[PDB]
């Protein structure tokens, strides 16, 4: 599994409605294998066409949280859903709060072809 396919597994949900219900994260975090061994503490799904997220790799370059150069902020805000493990959760009972919203996304991009391999952050600038 490439970090590129892993990015798709963990962060792409093109076909879902923006308006995620309160049970979306518990479902999806499980279906996309982010609750095996340990509960992934935070995760973001993007409700946009794959090519749109891929193009971000050719948009505004910005610094990644870890100080690497090759992150990119989306030109436009995107429909995303944030998933965040609750402060009560204990493996194997991973419970998530679901927060859908429209935000710019920042991804890291790598490879040939040059594609998203990491979801860095979301930005609320409007």
């Amino acid at each position: 599994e490439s970090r590129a396919k892993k990015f798709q597994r963990q962060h792409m949900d093109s076909d879902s409605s923006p308006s995620s219900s309160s049970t979306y994260c518990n479902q999806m975090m499980r279906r996309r294998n982010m609750t095996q061994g340990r509960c992934k503490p935070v995760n973001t799904f993007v409700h946009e066409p794959l090519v749109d997220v891929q193009n971000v790799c050719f948009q505004e370059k910005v610094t990644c949280k870890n100080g690497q150069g090759n992150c990119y902020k989306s030109n436009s805000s995107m429909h995303i859903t944030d998933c965040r493990l609750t402060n009560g959760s204990r493996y194997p009972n991973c419970a998530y709060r679901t927060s859908p919203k429209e935000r710019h996304i920042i991804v890291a991009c790598e490879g040939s072809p040059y594609v998203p391999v990491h979801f860095d952050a979301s930005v609320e600038d409007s």
């Binding site: 061994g37 992934k40 503490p41 935070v42 690497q68 402060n87 009560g88």
Partner: protein, 460 residues
Amino acid sequence: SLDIQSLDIQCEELSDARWAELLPLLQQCQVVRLDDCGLTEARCKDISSALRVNPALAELNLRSNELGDVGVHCVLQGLQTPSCKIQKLSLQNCCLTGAGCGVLSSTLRTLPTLQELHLSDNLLGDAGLQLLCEGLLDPQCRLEKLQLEYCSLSAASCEPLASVLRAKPDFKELTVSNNDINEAGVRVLCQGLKDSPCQLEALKLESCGVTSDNCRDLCGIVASKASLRELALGSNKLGDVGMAELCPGLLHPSSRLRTLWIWECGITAKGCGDLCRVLRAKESLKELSLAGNELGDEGARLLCETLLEPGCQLESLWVKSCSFTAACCSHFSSVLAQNRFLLELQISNNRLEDAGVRELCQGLGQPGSVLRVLWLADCDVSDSSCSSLAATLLANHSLRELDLSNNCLGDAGILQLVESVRQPGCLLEQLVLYDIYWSEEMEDRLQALEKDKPSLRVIS
């Protein structure tokens, strides 16, 4: 002879061809879990037929399927043969409504083997719950464990539940978390448990609108149920005043509560003081969650003081998002260096910084340290910290699991961890690295490490 089979499927679309292959297993298995497998009414009719002929079935878990009231009806009919020995049933998140509760109520009158029932994440409402309780009051109902989380219940459901508790001397666990039962609902349930002879082992009322005053009610329960092992009250506005009213019951000699879940309870450094007196007096208390309480560095000092004196035998401390800074880490460092009971420390989502993490590494690096699990997710750990961590991974030999998820590491930090974990002398079994960017070059090194050392699980 003995022939025990189990089937556990999660998050799979099951073709008609795979389904046909599974049906003989459904007729044979002691344990069947089909979680989020896209089960429909028609498959519920196959399930029904297969279970009618399964004399071995002890556990059936169909959670997270859109069964609906009709689907559930069909599955319950499959449990109604004289051969049925089901002990555990889960219909969590199954689109069950108040309209399906009559059929569930009548079924529950006819399954004396059934001990555990999970109905969470189903919109049951008060009328459905009340109807259910009528079945549960039947002398033929021998349920001991009931989970009703997010069931759309209010305080009106608590009287019916209290009556079920009074009727069942064998009751073991009640969960009603995520229902707005509120102060009066909580009081009525507590009276119900107090009246009941049940040796209750676990009570969970998280996000229930439990109030400070309800802590006098719960005080009574903790004082009264020597059988009680687990009490979970997270996400309620208990406050330091609530802690002050609870802790008297926790200090009763007869209390042997093992696990206390009070995350996000409005507790500060002051209530933390009350809890420290409990920790020092009660070596029965093994697991404590204060996650998401604003304890600050003074709460951390108070906890660590208690963890450094004889008495406290706490085994796991969950203090994620407690508003701790680097300044508390010399106290946790002494704890790790000296305390021989504490095996798990979850201190994620605190601004410990490289300075604070470095101090933890110093304490854990001391000979004789015992910590097994350390969670340091989102603690502002950078590549600097990784040299300290790499050193501790070779100096300490008790640690089995380390979580560094969601920190600002990259290739250079991870490389240092790799150089330690790759060595035969490093006995780390699990390294959790969610939400961290590394290069495709590092990815290959990690996959190489995985392949060369399969005893170590690298999770992301």
